[PDB]
Each structure stands twice: as C-alpha cells, then as structure tokens.
Amino acid sequence: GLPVFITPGSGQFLTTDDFQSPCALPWYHPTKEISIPGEVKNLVEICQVDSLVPINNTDTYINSENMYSVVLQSSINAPDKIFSIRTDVASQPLATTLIGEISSYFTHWTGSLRFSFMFCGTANTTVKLLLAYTPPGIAEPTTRKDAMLGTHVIWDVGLQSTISMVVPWISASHYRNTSPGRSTSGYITCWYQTRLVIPPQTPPTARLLCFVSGCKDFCLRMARDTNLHLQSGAIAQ
Amino acid sequence: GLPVFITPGSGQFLTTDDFQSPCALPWYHPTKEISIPGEVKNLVEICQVDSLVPINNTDTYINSENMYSVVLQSSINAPDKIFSIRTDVASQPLATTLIGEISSYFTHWTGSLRFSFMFCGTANTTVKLLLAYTPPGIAEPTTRKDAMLGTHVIWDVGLQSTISMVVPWISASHYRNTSPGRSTSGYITCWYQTRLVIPPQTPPTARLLCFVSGCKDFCLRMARDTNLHLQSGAIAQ
Amino acid sequence: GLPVFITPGSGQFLTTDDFQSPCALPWYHPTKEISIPGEVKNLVEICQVDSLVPINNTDT
Amino acid sequence: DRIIQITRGDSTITSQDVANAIVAYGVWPHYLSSKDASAIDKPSQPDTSSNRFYTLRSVTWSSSSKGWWWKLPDALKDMGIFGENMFYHYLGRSGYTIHVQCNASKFHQGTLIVALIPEHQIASALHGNVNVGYNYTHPGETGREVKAETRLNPDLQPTEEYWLNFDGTLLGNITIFPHQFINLRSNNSATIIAPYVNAVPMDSMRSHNNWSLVIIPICPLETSSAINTIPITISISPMCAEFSGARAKRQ
Amino acid sequence: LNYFNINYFKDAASNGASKLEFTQDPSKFTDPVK
Amino acid sequence: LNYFNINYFKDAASNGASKLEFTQDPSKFTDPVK
Amino acid sequence: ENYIDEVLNEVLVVPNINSSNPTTSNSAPALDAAETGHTSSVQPEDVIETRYVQTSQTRDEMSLESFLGRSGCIHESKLEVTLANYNKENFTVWAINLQEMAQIRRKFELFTYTRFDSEITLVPCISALSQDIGHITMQYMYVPPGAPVPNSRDDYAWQSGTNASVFWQHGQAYPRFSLPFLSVASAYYMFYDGYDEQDQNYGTANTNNMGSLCSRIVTEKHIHKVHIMTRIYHKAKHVKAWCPRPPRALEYTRAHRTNFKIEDRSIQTAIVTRPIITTA
Amino acid sequence: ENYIDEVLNEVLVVPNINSSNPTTSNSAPALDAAETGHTSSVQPEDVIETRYVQTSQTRDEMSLESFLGRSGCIHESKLEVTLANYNKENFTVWAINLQEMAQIRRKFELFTYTRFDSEITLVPCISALSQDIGHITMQYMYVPPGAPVPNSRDDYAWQSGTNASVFWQHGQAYPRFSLPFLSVASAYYMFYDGYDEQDQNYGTANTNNMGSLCSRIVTEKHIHKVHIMTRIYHKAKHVKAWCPRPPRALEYTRAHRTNFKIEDRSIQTAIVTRPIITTA
Ligand SMILES: CCCCCCCCCCCC(=O)O
Ligand SMILES: CCCCCCCCCCCC(=O)O
C-alpha cells in the first residue's frame, strides 16, 4: 500500500529508450563464443581506410571502370588544369566512398582529410604536378597563379609512385553539417607543372588514381537516416 | 509483485512540475563551452541599470525623441511647478522602462527607488531646483509650501551636472501589488527654486533628463504573465 | 523494469487522505511571520471559557 | 583628472577634458587560447603594422540632424594593411578601440548618445514579404544617415525609425549596451574599449558584422553664434588582430 | 527540511532542474570598466 | 554526475544496454600485417 | 544545512538597512556625473535618516532557471483525415523553430546567446464528426537535416531504422521526452547580423536549422471521419545566457525577421498620452 | 570518476594537435608506395605548420552499441475478420527473418557475422468498419521449428503447453519482451556461399531458420466488422561483429538473395553525372 504519484509521459513508446524487459525463454543457455579474426568495435576504424573516388563521372564513362582514372597527354605544353572537385565530405563525387557512405548516417562532422595519388605509366616516363587546396569564401581558381596562393604541394615522380597531401580543418565553428545546402568547404585542383616526357617508341598517355581517408581527428555525431538508398516497392519473400 | 497504492492526481499534466524523463538521443555528446563575456545569472542585475523615462508623453511629442526631455524658461519669475508623476513601479509613464518592463512579469514588489536628473544647458547658465516626494494618503500638492513639508532635496547646478535622490520604502505591509488598481504609492514633483539666469546673447531655454533604477533592497516574487504585449493575428512562417 | 503489483483501492479520491502532491509555484518564498498576540493551538482552550445561557427562552 | 593619452601603434591621441573610459563587460582584449581553438593551422599576427589608429570621414551636425550609424569591421574594409589582410584570408578576429571627438564653444548646448550594440540586426522599411539587400548594409566608411528624400529600390532599403532603434525596441532602454554621453557643457570626447564576442572562436570577416556604432542627438543643437554647424570625427584602432586560412584575394 | 534526490537515467539531459547557485552580484553592466 | 543501476530479472538478456568499453584502436584493417 | 535552506528557499539573502545620523561635511555623495556611462551608487542611508531593519526577502524567483523553466505552447498542428485516397494524404510536416508564439518568443529574446536542454510534452485531441471514433493510433517522428522526408502515408521512411519515433493511442497518458543541446556552435542565435554564402537570406534564417517533425495516423482504412489537433509544449533546463537586450515594443510580423510595418496601420506602442504634464 | 564520464559521455578521447616548425631534411614522410596494400600514416603536422590545439570531441556515438541499438520496424501483418466460417479463417503465419525492410537490412548487412540479444515491441491497431468495435482480444504465439503449426482458429495447438504466448486487449499498453541469442553456430550468417545437402537453395535460405510467428483473435462470434494491423519493432543489445563489407548500392529484389536485375529497367546508382570535370 505504498502511495505513488504518476508523472506525465507514462505508457509511451519512445524508439530510443533504454529499459529492461522480461525474457521469453527462461533457463536458456546460449552457445559458447569461439575466437573469430576481424572483430570491429568502433565505426572509426572503417573511416580510416582508403578507397577510390570516381573523379571522371561524365556520361560517357557512366557504368564502367573508366570513371576511376584520368588520362594525361604529352602533346600539351602549357600550365593547364586537369580536374577539380569539392571537399565537402558528403557531396558528389566523393559521397559514395567508404568515408562518404558512413558520414551519410550522421549530421555533423569535424577533422582533417587525407588524399593520395598514384601514377600508372611506363617506368621511363617522368612528370611534375601541382596539387592545391582553396579555402572557402572565394570563387574557384581558373589560373595557376591564383591556385598557387594557398595550401599546395609539388609532386615529382620517381621510384616511389604515391604522394599524400592533407586538407587542414579551417572553419569558424567546431562542426559542419554533412548536408550544407548553399555553403561550401573549398576546392582542390590539379595542374601541369612542367610537362610529360616520353622516350621514342612509347605510349603517349598515362593514367592517374585518387584515394581518400580520414586523419586522426575525424569524428561524427548526431546519427540520422541515410539519403543514398531507397525502397520503391515491396521485397518479395 | 510489490503491492502499491495509487494516490489522487496521477497522470495529470501540471505546467510547473519537475520530473525526469527519458532522453531521445542516447550517447550524444554536446559541444564544448568556450568563454563568452557578459554572462547573466540573475534578473536583478538588469533592474539595477538606469534608463530614461518618457516624462513628456503628450500628444504633440507622441512618436519622437522630444518625449524624453522637458524645457525650462527664463521668462518665469515665480515658484511654479514643472512636472509631476506617480511613483508606482508599474504604472505610466514609467511602466515602459527597463525596471518597469521587468516588474510586469511579477505581482509583488518591495524596496527603494533611485531617480537621477541631468542638466543640459550652456556652461554659463545657472539654476536652482527642488525635488520633493509625497507619501500616500493625501491629495497631490499644488503649492510649494505644501510640497516642502516632506522628503525633498535642493539641487544647485555647477561643474557636476547630475543629482540623485531616493524614494524610501514606506508602506503598511511588506509588499505591494504591481497592479494596484485604486491604491497609490505617492507622487514626485519639481519646482523652481530661485530662477534661470542667462548672460547676454545666449539661448533662453534649457532641457532636462530623468533616469530611474532600483536600490540594494529591490525584490520581486510570484511571477505572472506581462500585460504590455499582445498577439492579434498569426505570425507568418 | 521493476515488477510491481497493483492493489485494490487505487486511483480513488478519499476526502480524509494524506498524500504529497507537486507544487504549482516552484521557487516561491512566502512572507516572513511577525509576532501576533493571541495564537490558538487547540480547540480545548475555547471550551474552557464561560458564556451566558438563555434560561428564559419563552415566547415573550 | 581630465587628461588622457592613448598610444596604440605609431599614433597617439590626447584630450584635455574626458569622462573616464569604458571597458565593455569588464573584459580586456587578448589572444586566442588553445583550449578554445578550432582550426589547426598557425595564425598570422601583423602586430604593429595593423594595430594602429584609422580615422573615418567626418559628418556635419546641424539643428535638423537625426542620427547616423556604422558597422564593423565593414568600416575599415580598405584601410591599408588591415583591409589587405582581411581580404586575403578566410577567418579572423580582433578587438577595437573607439574614440569620438566633437568640440564646441562655451556658448553652445547639445547632447549626444554614443552606444555600441552587438549583433544589431536592423528591420526592413516596407511591409509584406521583403528583406534587406546586401549593398545597403555595407556602405563602407561613409556610413548611413537618416534622411527623408525618396531612395531607389524601396523593396531592399532598411527603415528610418531612429526612435525605435531601427529594429522595434524603444529608445531610452539602449543604456544596457556599453554607452557614453557627450554633453557640450561638460566634455567633448568619448572612449569605449571592446573585446571580441561571438559564439565561435573565429569567423568570416566579409559575411558577418560583430559590432555596430550608433550616434543619436537626444538634445537639439542651439547657439546664437555664427558657427551653427559642427563636425564630428571618429577614430578606430584594432587590437590583437590575427588571421588564418590564406588564399587568393576575394576581390 | 530534507528530501531524497536520485537520478534514474544514464543521460544528464534526462535529469531534473539544476540546483540554484549564485547571482554573480558583481555587475559589469552597472560599471562597465576594469 | 552519478546514477542508480539495478537489475531486476534473473536473465542476462533481460538487462539493458551494455556499458560502452573501448574501440580497439589498433586497426588490422589499415595495416593487414603481423 | 543545505537541504533546509533550499526547501525553505532561503538562499540568496538581501543586505540589511543600517541606521544613520545627521551629517554636515565637504564630501557630497549625492553629486555625481552621468556622462561617464556609470550608475550612481547612492544608498538610502546617505541622503535621509534611516532605521535599523533586518530584511527577510530572498531573490530566488528572479533566477534564470526559475524564469525560463516554465512550459509553454510553441505549435499547433491540425490533421484532417479523408476516406478517399487514404494512402496519399493524412501526414504533416513542420520545421522546428521557437519563433511562432508571442509569449515564448518575447521571453527568450531578452538575451543574445543561450544554451540549455529541452523537454517536450504532447497533448493530442480527437474531434468526432461521425457516430463513433473507434481505435485511433498516431506516430510522431523526428527527421534531422539531410534525412529523407516522407511524402505519403505509406512511405518506406516510416520504418524508422535510426530516426526516433513515439506512438500514442486513445486512452493513454501524455507523451514526454527530453532533448540535449543540439547545435554546431557553442550557443544558440536569437539575432544574427549576416548573410549566407550567396549574399542572401539576411538574419537568422541560415544559422538555425534543426530539422523537421513529422506525424501520421497508423490505423488502416475505416469508416469514421475525425480531426486530430496536437499541441507542443517546451521547457528549458540548465540555462545560461549572455548579453541582455531591450524588450520588444511592437507586435511580431514574420519569423526570423524584425519587421514591424503593417499595411494601412499606424504605429502603436504601450505608451498612453496625457492631457497635461503638471497633473499626475 | 566512472559515473561522471559516462553521464557526460566523455569516454573515448581524441588525440590533440601539436605545433610544428619549418623543416628541411633527407627523410620525406609524404612519399610512400601504395602497392603494399597499406594506408599512409601522414599527419597534418608533417606537411604544414600547425598550432597547438586541445581537442574536446569524443567518439562515443560511433560505437557499435549506439549504432545498432535503435528500434526499427521489420514486419507488418494485416488480419481481416469474416463473419462467415468464423472458426476456419482469422489466423496468420509468418516466418521470422530480418530481410524485408530496406533500412534495417542495409544497416545490418555492413558486416559478415554478428551476435546479439533482441528486444521486440508490438503496436496493434484496430480499424472500424461498422458502428462499433466492442471488446477485442488478440494472442501471439511463437512456434519453434518442428512444433505443430495451427491451421484453424480453434486448433488444439493454441493451448500453448510449452510454447510462449502473449495476450493483448483494447485499452492496454504496448507488449514487449526479450529474446536471447538463439542459433546453432556461434554467430549469425548474413552471407553464405554454399548449398544444402541436395545441392539446392544457394545462399542463406538454409542456414537461417528460426521458426514462425502466429496470431489469432480470441473473441468469439460477434456482429462487428474490423481489420487488425500489427507492426513489429526490433532492437539489438550486447552486439559484436566481424569482417566489414562494402555498403549496398542498388535496391533489393528478393530475400536471402543478392539479385538486382529488374525487367524493363536500366541500372541506377547514387552517382550523378557532370558536364565537364574541370568545373566543380
Ligand atoms: C520539437 C522540438 C522542439 C525543440 C526546439 C528547441 C530548440 C530551439 C533552439 C533555437 C531555435 C530558435 O531560436 O528558433
Ligand atoms: C519476432 C522475432 C524476431 C527475431 C529476429 C531476430 C533474429 C534474427 C537473426 C538472423 C535473421 C536473419 O539474418 O535473417
């Protein structure tokens, strides 16, 4: 006969609650747990793994393997641009990578980003390139002089065939929305530095690859529902 | 199977209750708190700040800056009255000041009040004035002799241009209603003491300003809803 | 998830009960109490005071 | 006393009759600590080449004036090294020091109100579904003056209700903001020192205005002399400025 | 005189009202100066 | 700051969510090698 | 010692009043200068003869937690069911903002920045337009920014894989839940002097974006005509604030804006005129 | 010390950022070789000049328990009662599987093996097709493999000698119960590369068989026409996982299968084309 007082919100079903409930199978003893390699404990281990990014997402190479590489020409003698993408973690074309796919389940993000490039050409072929990052608040650069005035790295190909640059975290606040709308986070571009030189009787073109992964300060919060998948009809049983 | 007894009043929704409820966002970690200047902890700090009072609230100066000042004439040689207002904290015209606006959210009040006056005239102009406060229970004075028989201060203008008088707390009970209805709390008046004297080739008029703030014994209680604001239609989204 | 058992007589309104209820005016501080002469604590003090009795209650 | 002397960079200001000085919210400006930092790159501190005094264009005070207002750091958008650094970077923060000077004779009378308002969001002039254009909130060093003649683009201009603080709040309650008075019979100068206040450690300098300066004549100017129009001058000095995120020039 | 006070949920937001502390009497508003 | 935590049922499945532990930072995924 | 004071609400004491005597000296505390932007510090025992009084009031009710810790309505949603095209209509979407009710908006707009936790309570009501109501069930789901927004009663988005949801049925008590401080910055913005990246949307319309709140009726097709009206109440906990501002004087017109002009209407405030200033 | 951190969710700290100075040496940490199948270990303080920053974020929300511990709908069953042949119809049978709702299926198929306990909640709804509903009672029974499956409303199998059952009636709250990890092996299979003993049924259609869930209406004959719709929600506790896999890119077609082809339909993914690659 203990007197009690009922508070508002009783009897409701909240999806994200945490309460204990009686079991339907008393005295049941589950199977023992053997050791299996490859146990994942946090989602941040997945985000620290490189994956290719579809740079060449035009209509011609829409469903093939040609969308992951970009071609270089040796007939060009000028400081020209090769490609340019946005650095927003959840925007195209890098929204479909591993880190992009995982980030679509949250709303806020922070930390730095790491980009890697690999050169796939003949061992007798040499080139020099320039990779630059542009902080927000200004239009996209159109000439090498404007691109140089910023965070940039100069790459020379040799015995090693991979380079890695980082995009520092530069923002007014501490977090950013994974779906920004009208705001941006900057651009990254690539330009010819000197030329692409080949010996006689050699293919006159070369390919390139790009990877992306998160640095040691990457983080996510405020989990939500992803927007990269949908169910139109009904799944057949 | 603990026996319990249900008491009356269970399941109700009381607006001013205090109960714990489950959270809808488990494991969420809010953003850190940086230091921002200007942190307010109590509402009494706002009430201890001076603000102007619209003494001249006639129809001519209804929407302008002329309602905050009163003019003095040098062509008057007589003990005349300049202005008079009521000392109720939540009545016109001092109901729209900071302390008046804050007091409209409560029902009871207590403590003393502080009034300040500033003289805005030529540096070669001199005057003497009389400020008096009349306790309740009697009609408003009409002559300087009646006004003098009370709490009053004599002001002489010089290098300093500001004077400050206080209105002591005199009441039968310990608190007063912010909306009194028929009762009153007294009056405060201003009279010419000697004259306003100017040199040759000088403007013949001068202006005055008034401020108000609470003393160290001001207090409020029994919070309610304000009556100085209303919503007629619907706010467009 | 503590299991409980409901006993008869729950939810009723008994006029002479004694239970605690939430307050509608949080953080309110009532007025102080001054000393007033003549404080009554029990009803037996009233019963120990003389009073006249209408012995002659005729119609006249 | 009435004497004051302030030296920021290579410039000095003196005055022989002032009324103390105001430190906004009782906090002195300083640099950014590592406990609150968000960006990871190294900031740039021009020091003495940018923390100096800059003077804006003067205005005329007559018997029919109504008021003026400015915005920061929009006013100093082209003042040498500070403007160049503001337009070459992406983030920045700084404090300020404001000095207002206006002198008259001993046969004049008048009073001014000088206030500094944070996050002063002004209201529109017309009714319906309208908003405020970008060009009219960034007038540069000239500032904005309340007038009566018809302006162009009525659907983008702000309001002229000076007595409503330009945003729907009664004048006379403005004393909560850091403020000072100028009485012609007492003093002729005002000084306010303000730190950096915001909800974020650092922010874009071309899309956000932290502070605003408002001048309102509460008592009309009146005199019997032949000098019936008095000028007003304003000087501003950045304190502890730093920038980050270098790129190409926005302009 | 006294009363019991126990939290039941694991989240801080889930708890009740904060305990009234101080009013920071020193007012920089009244005297905005060092 | 603190909170109560008592189990009422006799089964472990009946209890609430498990206490967050570690993330096993060493990632064999990043560097799949001894 | 600490339970007793707060149970009696005897914290936050007020200074007493000291007795005074007639004085005559060179120092004049009554005189001062108001051009310095400071408030005078004159006390009653400096200009009049006072009596020793032991004050007993306490300033607990003027604290921020007491002032802002009261529930108030912030929204009202009306849902009318139709028996034709049952699986297309019968859902509502609302964007979260505390700028549609005059009382709450004016109370909270007294400062520039704030930081607090929230508490939400729902009050559902059913209006009967037929002979009977039957069994009615309702669902409310919270959609953070970027998540898919349903556009039909039978959309797949209602499965609520990660989104939080709550259910209510006739005969049940009022639902209630709590929310933490959910913002990118360290505080909320009530006034913003800035634009977006395209130099558009002046005001707070860009910084504040907390998502949407959706609702639907879960019961299948039936033969009853009803209307559902739900009211949402909000209360703040663990409150902090900065930089107070003057109170609003006129009526609000639009959300996220400070416009006050009204077509064919003069400006009206709370000030009442007088015939003459020499008569109170 | 342990209550405080978890109440504030301050576990799982993140490393800080250290300051750096200009360098010029023979060692070049920026250069590496990606043919080794390893991830580069370059940090921001190796290629640029940084500032000392004390980070404050915590990675608690990306844990597996937080990620997978949310309720979501997995099934919807519709039961229409008929007043003719009352004792023959009016029962439903469903085979348990977590492969019929896109959100839950895609969330859980990010790994190869998992092991967890379950929690089930039911949301019953009644649709009125007549003047009144009356009194309605429902029963749900769990049938493990090998147990007799009822085929009528009045079958003897409803006596529930050993099978677990639950009852619901109008005006009652939502039922809820828990289940342990019930599998023959040490983990669940989301992908299986194998067949059965007859070299048939390729996939997971053979390893996963948890039984069936049955329901019926217990009320006897009446004169009311109603429809009953019940929704089942599931949440996982004490979760472990192994061997992560790439996320799904296309829509699902069938259960226990990975087929994606659709008649008279081109292949569509989430990638959006561009006019030219030199303009972002
Ligand atoms: C139903 C969810 C309602 C929660 C809203 C409270 C948080 C809003 C804080 C800032 C909103 C604004 O100022 O408009
Ligand atoms: C109503 C009972 C529902 C319980 C199902 C949860 C356990 C299923 C685990 C594996 C099922 C599968 O992967 O299809």
mmCIF file of N, CA and C in Angstrom, chain A residues 161-203:
data_model
loop_
_atom_site.group_PDB
_atom_site.id
_atom_site.type_symbol
_atom_site.label_atom_id
_atom_site.label_comp_id
_atom_site.label_asym_id
_atom_site.label_seq_id
_atom_site.Cartn_x
_atom_site.Cartn_y
_atom_site.Cartn_z
ATOM 1 N N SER A 161 55.822 5.877 -56.257
ATOM 2 C CA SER A 161 54.756 6.248 -57.177
ATOM 3 C C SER A 161 53.522 6.795 -56.473
ATOM 4 N N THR A 162 53.631 7.171 -55.200
ATOM 5 C CA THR A 162 52.482 7.651 -54.451
ATOM 6 C C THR A 162 52.858 8.889 -53.650
ATOM 7 N N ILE A 163 51.950 9.864 -53.631
ATOM 8 C CA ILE A 163 52.081 11.070 -52.827
ATOM 9 C C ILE A 163 50.812 11.221 -52.005
ATOM 10 N N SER A 164 50.923 11.907 -50.870
ATOM 11 C CA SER A 164 49.786 12.098 -49.977
ATOM 12 C C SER A 164 49.812 13.509 -49.417
ATOM 13 N N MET A 165 48.735 14.251 -49.645
ATOM 14 C CA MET A 165 48.533 15.574 -49.077
ATOM 15 C C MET A 165 47.326 15.549 -48.145
ATOM 16 N N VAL A 166 47.237 16.562 -47.288
ATOM 17 C CA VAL A 166 46.151 16.661 -46.323
ATOM 18 C C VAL A 166 45.431 17.985 -46.509
ATOM 19 N N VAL A 167 44.165 18.011 -46.103
ATOM 20 C CA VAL A 167 43.323 19.199 -46.150
ATOM 21 C C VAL A 167 43.067 19.638 -44.709
ATOM 22 N N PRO A 168 43.676 20.725 -44.247
ATOM 23 C CA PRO A 168 43.522 21.115 -42.842
ATOM 24 C C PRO A 168 42.109 21.584 -42.533
ATOM 25 N N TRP A 169 41.735 21.453 -41.264
ATOM 26 C CA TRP A 169 40.421 21.878 -40.798
ATOM 27 C C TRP A 169 40.441 23.382 -40.566
ATOM 28 N N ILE A 170 39.692 24.121 -41.381
ATOM 29 C CA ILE A 170 39.601 25.572 -41.283
ATOM 30 C C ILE A 170 38.128 25.942 -41.347
ATOM 31 N N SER A 171 37.548 26.284 -40.199
ATOM 32 C CA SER A 171 36.149 26.683 -40.144
ATOM 33 C C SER A 171 35.947 27.615 -38.961
ATOM 34 N N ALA A 172 34.869 28.400 -39.029
ATOM 35 C CA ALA A 172 34.556 29.321 -37.944
ATOM 36 C C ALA A 172 34.119 28.571 -36.692
ATOM 37 N N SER A 173 33.219 27.606 -36.845
ATOM 38 C CA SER A 173 32.707 26.821 -35.736
ATOM 39 C C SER A 173 33.552 25.565 -35.545
ATOM 40 N N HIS A 174 33.055 24.654 -34.710
ATOM 41 C CA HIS A 174 33.758 23.406 -34.447
ATOM 42 C C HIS A 174 33.246 22.246 -35.290
ATOM 43 N N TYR A 175 32.029 22.335 -35.820
ATOM 44 C CA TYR A 175 31.447 21.265 -36.616
ATOM 45 C C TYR A 175 30.833 21.850 -37.878
ATOM 46 N N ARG A 176 30.543 20.967 -38.830
ATOM 47 C CA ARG A 176 29.889 21.338 -40.075
ATOM 48 C C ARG A 176 28.755 20.365 -40.350
ATOM 49 N N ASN A 177 27.742 20.842 -41.064
ATOM 50 C CA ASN A 177 26.644 19.976 -41.467
ATOM 51 C C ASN A 177 27.067 19.093 -42.634
ATOM 52 N N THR A 178 26.741 17.802 -42.541
ATOM 53 C CA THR A 178 27.038 16.890 -43.639
ATOM 54 C C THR A 178 26.229 17.214 -44.885
ATOM 55 N N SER A 179 25.071 17.849 -44.730
ATOM 56 C CA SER A 179 24.288 18.358 -45.856
ATOM 57 C C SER A 179 24.258 19.871 -45.749
ATOM 58 N N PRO A 180 25.177 20.578 -46.407
ATOM 59 C CA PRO A 180 25.326 22.017 -46.153
ATOM 60 C C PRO A 180 24.277 22.870 -46.846
ATOM 61 N N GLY A 181 23.861 22.469 -48.030
ATOM 62 C CA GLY A 181 22.902 23.250 -48.805
ATOM 63 C C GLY A 181 23.610 24.259 -49.702
ATOM 64 N N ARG A 182 23.685 25.509 -49.242
ATOM 65 C CA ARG A 182 24.297 26.571 -50.030
ATOM 66 C C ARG A 182 25.756 26.826 -49.675
ATOM 67 N N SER A 183 26.191 26.464 -48.470
ATOM 68 C CA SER A 183 27.564 26.717 -48.068
ATOM 69 C C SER A 183 28.509 25.712 -48.724
ATOM 70 N N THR A 184 29.794 26.055 -48.726
ATOM 71 C CA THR A 184 30.819 25.194 -49.296
ATOM 72 C C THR A 184 31.975 25.095 -48.312
ATOM 73 N N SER A 185 32.920 24.209 -48.624
ATOM 74 C CA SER A 185 34.077 23.979 -47.769
ATOM 75 C C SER A 185 35.399 24.140 -48.509
ATOM 76 N N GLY A 186 35.369 24.474 -49.791
ATOM 77 C CA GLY A 186 36.571 24.694 -50.566
ATOM 78 C C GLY A 186 36.651 23.772 -51.768
ATOM 79 N N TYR A 187 37.748 23.924 -52.508
ATOM 80 C CA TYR A 187 38.007 23.140 -53.705
ATOM 81 C C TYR A 187 39.439 22.630 -53.687
ATOM 82 N N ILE A 188 39.686 21.598 -54.492
ATOM 83 C CA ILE A 188 41.027 21.067 -54.710
ATOM 84 C C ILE A 188 41.212 20.845 -56.205
ATOM 85 N N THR A 189 42.351 21.292 -56.737
ATOM 86 C CA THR A 189 42.617 21.263 -58.168
ATOM 87 C C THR A 189 43.981 20.641 -58.433
ATOM 88 N N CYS A 190 44.223 20.316 -59.701
ATOM 89 C CA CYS A 190 45.494 19.758 -60.144
ATOM 90 C C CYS A 190 45.911 20.425 -61.446
ATOM 91 N N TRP A 191 47.194 20.770 -61.551
ATOM 92 C CA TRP A 191 47.714 21.490 -62.704
ATOM 93 C C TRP A 191 49.015 20.855 -63.171
ATOM 94 N N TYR A 192 49.299 21.007 -64.464
ATOM 95 C CA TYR A 192 50.595 20.613 -65.001
ATOM 96 C C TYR A 192 51.675 21.540 -64.462
ATOM 97 N N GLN A 193 52.798 20.963 -64.037
ATOM 98 C CA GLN A 193 53.902 21.784 -63.551
ATOM 99 C C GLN A 193 54.921 22.066 -64.652
ATOM 100 N N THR A 194 55.542 21.019 -65.209
ATOM 101 C CA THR A 194 56.484 21.212 -66.307
ATOM 102 C C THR A 194 56.000 20.571 -67.602
ATOM 103 N N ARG A 195 55.862 19.246 -67.657
ATOM 104 C CA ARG A 195 55.435 18.537 -68.862
ATOM 105 C C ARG A 195 55.443 17.040 -68.565
ATOM 106 N N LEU A 196 54.958 16.266 -69.535
ATOM 107 C CA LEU A 196 55.056 14.810 -69.523
ATOM 108 C C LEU A 196 55.960 14.398 -70.679
ATOM 109 N N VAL A 197 57.100 13.789 -70.359
ATOM 110 C CA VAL A 197 58.141 13.493 -71.340
ATOM 111 C C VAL A 197 58.263 11.985 -71.508
ATOM 112 N N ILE A 198 58.294 11.532 -72.759
ATOM 113 C CA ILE A 198 58.361 10.107 -73.071
ATOM 114 C C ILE A 198 59.522 9.833 -74.023
ATOM 115 N N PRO A 199 60.106 8.640 -73.992
ATOM 116 C CA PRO A 199 61.162 8.295 -74.950
ATOM 117 C C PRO A 199 60.562 7.848 -76.272
ATOM 118 N N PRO A 200 61.386 7.636 -77.302
ATOM 119 C CA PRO A 200 60.850 7.128 -78.571
ATOM 120 C C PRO A 200 60.244 5.741 -78.417
ATOM 121 N N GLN A 201 59.215 5.478 -79.225
ATOM 122 C CA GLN A 201 58.501 4.201 -79.236
ATOM 123 C C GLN A 201 57.933 3.876 -77.852
ATOM 124 N N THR A 202 57.129 4.800 -77.347
ATOM 125 C CA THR A 202 56.482 4.682 -76.051
ATOM 126 C C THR A 202 55.051 5.176 -76.189
ATOM 127 N N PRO A 203 54.114 4.586 -75.450
ATOM 128 C CA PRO A 203 52.746 5.116 -75.432
ATOM 129 C C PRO A 203 52.732 6.561 -74.976
#
